[PDB]
Write a protein that holds these residues in place. Structure first.
Motif, PDB file in Angstrom:
ATOM      1  N   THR A 129       9.877   4.754   6.471  1.00 42.13           N
ATOM      2  CA  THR A 129      10.813   3.703   6.840  1.00 42.13           C
ATOM      3  C   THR A 129      10.365   3.210   8.200  1.00 42.13           C
ATOM      4  OG1 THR A 129      12.692   4.738   5.681  1.00 42.13           O
ATOM      5  CG2 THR A 129      13.194   3.143   7.411  1.00 42.13           C
ATOM      6  N   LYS A 130       9.951   4.153   9.037  1.00 43.36           N
ATOM      7  CA  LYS A 130       9.517   3.804  10.371  1.00 43.36           C
ATOM      8  C   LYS A 130       8.273   2.939  10.345  1.00 43.36           C
ATOM      9  CE  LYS A 130       8.044   6.058  14.674  1.00 43.36           C
ATOM     10  NZ  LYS A 130       6.567   6.166  14.380  1.00 43.36           N
ATOM     11  N   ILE A 131       7.364   3.223   9.427  1.00 41.01           N
ATOM     12  CA  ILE A 131       6.145   2.442   9.349  1.00 41.01           C
ATOM     13  C   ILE A 131       6.366   1.015   8.870  1.00 41.01           C
ATOM     14  CG2 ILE A 131       3.800   2.332   8.538  1.00 41.01           C
ATOM     15  CD1 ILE A 131       4.502   4.710  10.248  1.00 41.01           C
ATOM     16  N   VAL A 132       7.177   0.821   7.836  1.00 39.61           N
ATOM     17  CA  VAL A 132       7.388  -0.549   7.371  1.00 39.61           C
ATOM     18  C   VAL A 132       8.131  -1.365   8.432  1.00 39.61           C
ATOM     19  CG1 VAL A 132       7.288   0.172   4.994  1.00 39.61           C
ATOM     20  CG2 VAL A 132       9.469   0.005   6.104  1.00 39.61           C
ATOM     21  N   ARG A 133       9.097  -0.743   9.105  1.00 41.54           N
ATOM     22  CA  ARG A 133       9.823  -1.436  10.179  1.00 41.54           C
ATOM     23  C   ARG A 133       8.893  -1.896  11.300  1.00 41.54           C
ATOM     24  NH1 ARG A 133      15.388   2.094  10.513  1.00 41.54           N
ATOM     25  NH2 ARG A 133      16.280   1.193   8.598  1.00 41.54           N
ATOM     26  N   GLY A 134       7.925  -1.060  11.665  1.00 40.05           N
ATOM     27  CA  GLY A 134       6.972  -1.419  12.697  1.00 40.05           C
ATOM     28  C   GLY A 134       6.077  -2.573  12.263  1.00 40.05           C
ATOM     29  N   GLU A 135       5.660  -2.564  11.003  1.00 39.97           N
ATOM     30  CA  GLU A 135       4.829  -3.625  10.456  1.00 39.97           C
ATOM     31  C   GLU A 135       5.650  -4.900  10.363  1.00 39.97           C
ATOM     32  OE1 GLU A 135       2.078  -0.562   7.836  1.00 39.97           O
ATOM     33  OE2 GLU A 135       3.312  -2.012   6.751  1.00 39.97           O
ATOM     34  N   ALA A 136       6.891  -4.807   9.879  1.00 43.44           N
ATOM     35  CA  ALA A 136       7.714  -6.004   9.794  1.00 43.44           C
ATOM     36  C   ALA A 136       7.787  -6.571  11.208  1.00 43.44           C
ATOM     37  CB  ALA A 136       9.109  -5.663   9.288  1.00 43.44           C
ATOM     38  N   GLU A 137       8.153  -5.703  12.148  1.00 48.08           N
ATOM     39  CA  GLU A 137       8.295  -6.055  13.555  1.00 48.08           C
ATOM     40  C   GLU A 137       7.057  -6.796  14.032  1.00 48.08           C
ATOM     41  OE1 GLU A 137       8.019  -6.089  16.907  1.00 48.08           O
ATOM     42  OE2 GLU A 137      10.013  -6.951  16.549  1.00 48.08           O
ATOM     43  N   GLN A 138       5.887  -6.221  13.759  1.00 45.67           N
ATOM     44  CA  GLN A 138       4.636  -6.856  14.138  1.00 45.67           C
ATOM     45  C   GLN A 138       4.551  -8.269  13.532  1.00 45.67           C
ATOM     46  OE1 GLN A 138       1.550  -6.989  11.580  1.00 45.67           O
ATOM     47  NE2 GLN A 138       1.261  -8.700  13.009  1.00 45.67           N
ATOM     48  N   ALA A 139       4.905  -8.390  12.256  1.00 43.57           N
ATOM     49  CA  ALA A 139       4.872  -9.679  11.574  1.00 43.57           C
ATOM     50  C   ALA A 139       5.787 -10.690  12.268  1.00 43.57           C
ATOM     51  CB  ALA A 139       5.282  -9.521  10.062  1.00 43.57           C
ATOM     52  N   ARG A 140       6.959 -10.232  12.705  1.00 47.11           N
ATOM     53  CA  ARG A 140       7.889 -11.112  13.387  1.00 47.11           C
ATOM     54  C   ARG A 140       7.393 -11.568  14.754  1.00 47.11           C
ATOM     55  NH1 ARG A 140      12.204  -8.275  10.740  1.00 47.11           N
ATOM     56  NH2 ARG A 140      11.747  -6.579  12.210  1.00 47.11           N
ATOM     57  N   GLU A 196      12.651  -0.939   1.732  1.00 51.21           N
ATOM     58  CA  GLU A 196      13.561   0.158   2.064  1.00 51.21           C
ATOM     59  C   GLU A 196      14.426   0.506   0.853  1.00 51.21           C
ATOM     60  OE1 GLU A 196      15.299   0.692   5.950  1.00 51.21           O
ATOM     61  OE2 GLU A 196      14.605  -1.312   6.566  1.00 51.21           O
ATOM     62  N   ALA A 197      14.789  -0.493   0.050  1.00 50.80           N
ATOM     63  CA  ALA A 197      15.601  -0.252  -1.146  1.00 50.80           C
ATOM     64  C   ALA A 197      14.780   0.616  -2.084  1.00 50.80           C
ATOM     65  CB  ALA A 197      15.956  -1.555  -1.821  1.00 50.80           C
ATOM     66  N   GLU A 198      13.475   0.373  -2.074  1.00 43.92           N
ATOM     67  CA  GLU A 198      12.523   1.112  -2.885  1.00 43.92           C
ATOM     68  C   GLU A 198      12.468   2.559  -2.351  1.00 43.92           C
ATOM     69  OE1 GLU A 198       8.082   0.464  -2.755  1.00 43.92           O
ATOM     70  OE2 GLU A 198       8.515  -1.028  -4.301  1.00 43.92           O
ATOM     71  N   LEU A 199      12.242   2.708  -1.044  1.00 42.84           N
ATOM     72  CA  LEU A 199      12.178   4.021  -0.389  1.00 42.84           C
ATOM     73  C   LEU A 199      13.440   4.846  -0.586  1.00 42.84           C
ATOM     74  CD1 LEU A 199       9.708   4.814   1.452  1.00 42.84           C
ATOM     75  CD2 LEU A 199      10.013   2.358   1.251  1.00 42.84           C
ATOM     76  N   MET A 200      14.572   4.157  -0.521  1.00 43.14           N
ATOM     77  CA  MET A 200      15.885   4.754  -0.648  1.00 43.14           C
ATOM     78  C   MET A 200      16.290   4.879  -2.107  1.00 43.14           C
ATOM     79  SD  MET A 200      19.334   3.101   0.886  1.00 43.14           S
ATOM     80  CE  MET A 200      18.545   3.048   2.522  1.00 43.14           C
ATOM     81  N   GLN A 201      15.455   4.339  -2.988  1.00 41.56           N
ATOM     82  CA  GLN A 201      15.732   4.349  -4.418  1.00 41.56           C
ATOM     83  C   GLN A 201      15.872   5.784  -4.929  1.00 41.56           C
ATOM     84  OE1 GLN A 201      16.487   4.411  -7.457  1.00 41.56           O
ATOM     85  NE2 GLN A 201      14.849   3.503  -8.719  1.00 41.56           N
ATOM     86  N   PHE A 202      14.746   6.474  -5.059  1.00 45.46           N
ATOM     87  CA  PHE A 202      14.761   7.843  -5.548  1.00 45.46           C
ATOM     88  C   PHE A 202      14.316   8.815  -4.461  1.00 45.46           C
ATOM     89  N   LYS A 246       0.818  -1.203   0.000  1.00 43.36           N
ATOM     90  CA  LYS A 246       0.000   0.000   0.000  1.00 43.36           C
ATOM     91  C   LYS A 246       0.858   1.262   0.000  1.00 43.36           C
ATOM     92  CE  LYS A 246      -3.986  -1.930   2.483  1.00 43.36           C
ATOM     93  NZ  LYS A 246      -4.850  -1.853   1.262  1.00 43.36           N
ATOM     94  N   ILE A 247       2.011   1.180   0.656  1.00 41.19           N
ATOM     95  CA  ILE A 247       2.944   2.298   0.767  1.00 41.19           C
ATOM     96  C   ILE A 247       3.581   2.774  -0.541  1.00 41.19           C
ATOM     97  CG2 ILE A 247       5.251   2.927   1.565  1.00 41.19           C
ATOM     98  CD1 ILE A 247       2.464   1.001   3.420  1.00 41.19           C
ATOM     99  N   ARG A 248       3.347   4.037  -0.865  1.00 36.41           N
ATOM    100  CA  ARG A 248       3.923   4.610  -2.062  1.00 36.41           C
ATOM    101  C   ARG A 248       5.307   5.146  -1.698  1.00 36.41           C
ATOM    102  NH1 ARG A 248      -1.043   7.837  -5.217  1.00 36.41           N
ATOM    103  NH2 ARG A 248      -2.375   5.980  -5.496  1.00 36.41           N
ATOM    104  N   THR A 249       6.264   4.950  -2.586  1.00 37.57           N
ATOM    105  CA  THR A 249       7.621   5.389  -2.320  1.00 37.57           C
ATOM    106  C   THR A 249       8.076   6.574  -3.178  1.00 37.57           C
ATOM    107  OG1 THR A 249       8.408   3.696  -3.841  1.00 37.57           O
ATOM    108  CG2 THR A 249       8.254   3.108  -1.526  1.00 37.57           C
ATOM    109  N   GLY A 250       7.224   6.979  -4.122  1.00 36.62           N
ATOM    110  CA  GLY A 250       7.531   8.102  -4.999  1.00 36.62           C
ATOM    111  C   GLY A 250       6.297   8.970  -5.151  1.00 36.62           C
ATOM    112  N   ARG A 251       6.437  10.135  -5.777  1.00 34.26           N
ATOM    113  CA  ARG A 251       5.306  11.046  -5.956  1.00 34.26           C
ATOM    114  C   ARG A 251       4.343  10.698  -7.095  1.00 34.26           C
ATOM    115  NH1 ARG A 251       5.602  15.203  -2.904  1.00 34.26           N
ATOM    116  NH2 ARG A 251       7.581  15.770  -1.915  1.00 34.26           N
ATOM    117  N   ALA A 252       4.822   9.933  -8.057  1.00 33.00           N
ATOM    118  CA  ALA A 252       4.035   9.561  -9.220  1.00 33.00           C
ATOM    119  C   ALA A 252       2.612   9.035  -9.037  1.00 33.00           C
ATOM    120  CB  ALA A 252       4.840   8.561 -10.073  1.00 33.00           C
ATOM    121  N   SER A 253       1.661   9.701  -9.679  1.00 36.69           N
ATOM    122  CA  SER A 253       0.244   9.292  -9.686  1.00 36.69           C
ATOM    123  C   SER A 253      -0.434   9.956 -10.874  1.00 36.69           C
ATOM    124  CB  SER A 253      -0.487   9.722  -8.406  1.00 36.69           C
ATOM    125  OG  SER A 253      -1.883   9.870  -8.660  1.00 36.69           O
ATOM    126  N   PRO A 254      -1.420   9.291 -11.495  1.00 37.08           N
ATOM    127  CA  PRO A 254      -2.122   9.892 -12.634  1.00 37.08           C
ATOM    128  C   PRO A 254      -2.898  11.190 -12.318  1.00 37.08           C
ATOM    129  CG  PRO A 254      -3.302   7.989 -11.830  1.00 37.08           C
ATOM    130  CD  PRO A 254      -1.877   7.904 -11.308  1.00 37.08           C
TER     131      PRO A 254
END
Ligand SMILES: CCCCCCCCCCOCO
Ligand SMILES: [Hg+2]
Ligand SMILES: [Hg+2]
Ligand SMILES: [Hg+2]
Length: 185
Positions: free
Chosen positions: A114-125, A179-185, A26-34
Motif C-alpha cells: 500500500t505504501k509503495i503504490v501511494r508513493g508512486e501515485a504521489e510521484q505521479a501527482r 488498494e481495493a485490489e490489495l484490500m480485496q483478499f 507490476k504489483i501482485r496483490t495475491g499469492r497466485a502464480s503458476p
C-alpha cells in the motif's frame, strides 16, 4: 503558440499517468502464480520429484490454484505431498483435479505494498503539477512581451488547470482500484 503549449502539456500529463498505470500493474496483490508450488517434493515411484515435473499448475483465480496431475494414479500422492510440505495449504481434491486455495498476503506485506503504490501515485501527482506549472509559465510569461492578453491568459490557465484535474483524477482512480485490489483478499 498557445495552440501548442496546452496540447503539449496534456501529452506530457498523459505520459505521466500512463507511466504510473504501468508501474503499478507490476504489483501482485495475491499469492497466485503458476510456479508457486513447483518446489513441493512428491514421492513418485520411490524417487522424490518436484511437483513441477508431475503436473500442470494453472491459476484458477487470484487466491486459488488448480493442479492438473498428468498421471491420475499420482493424484493421491500429490495431495499428500502438498499437505506434507507444511505450508498451511489445505488441498481440495475432487474429480481428476486438485485445487489449492491460498492464504492472503500478510498484513505486513499489504502495508508494504500500500505504501509503495501511494508513493508512486504521489510521484505521479508531483510530475503532473510540474507540467501544469511549466505550462502556466509559458502562458503567463508570453503575456509579458508577446501577443496574448488577460482574458486569453485566464482561459488558457483554466483550460490547463482542468487538464491537471483530469490527469490527477486518473491517477486517483488507478490508485483506488489498486488498494481495493490489495484490500480485496
Ligand atoms: C511458494 C509456496 C508458498 C506457500 C505460501 C503459503 C503462505 C506462507 C506465508 C508465510 O508466512 C510465514 O510463514
Ligand atoms: Hg509518472
Ligand atoms: Hg504425474
Ligand atoms: Hg511426468
Amino acid at each position: 503558440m498557445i495552440s501548442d503549449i496546452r496540447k503539449d502539456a496534456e501529452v506530457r500529463m498523459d505520459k505521466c499517468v500512463e507511466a504510473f498505470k504501468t508501474q503499478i500493474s507490476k504489483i501482485r496483490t495475491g499469492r497466485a502464480s503458476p510456479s508457486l508450488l513447483d518446489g513441493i517434493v512428491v514421492e513418485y515411484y520411490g524417487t522424490p520429484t518436484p511437483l513441477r515435473q508431475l503436473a500442470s499448475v494453472t491459476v484458477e483465480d487470484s487466491r486459488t490454484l488448480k493442479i492438473n496431475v498428468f498421471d491420475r494414479s499420482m493424484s493421491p500422492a500429490v495431495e499428500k505431498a502438498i499437505m506434507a510440505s507444511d505450508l498451511g495449504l489445505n488441498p481440495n481434491s475432487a474429480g481428476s483435479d486438485i485445487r489449492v486455495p491460498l492464504p492472503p498476503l500478510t498484513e505486513e506485506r499489504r502495508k508494504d505494498l500500500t505504501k509503495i503504490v501511494r508513493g508512486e501515485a504521489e510521484q505521479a501527482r508531483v510530475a503532473v503539477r510540474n507540467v501544469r506549472r511549466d505550462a502556466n509559465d509559458k502562458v503567463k510569461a508570453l503575456l509579458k512581451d508577446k501577443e496574448i492578453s488577460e482574458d486569453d491568459d485566464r482561459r488558457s490557465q483554466d483550460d490547463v488547470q482542468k487538464l491537471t484535474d483530469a490527469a490527477i483524477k486518473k491517477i486517483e482512480a488507478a490508485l483506488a482500484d489498486k488498494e481495493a485490489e490489495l484490500m480485496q483478499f
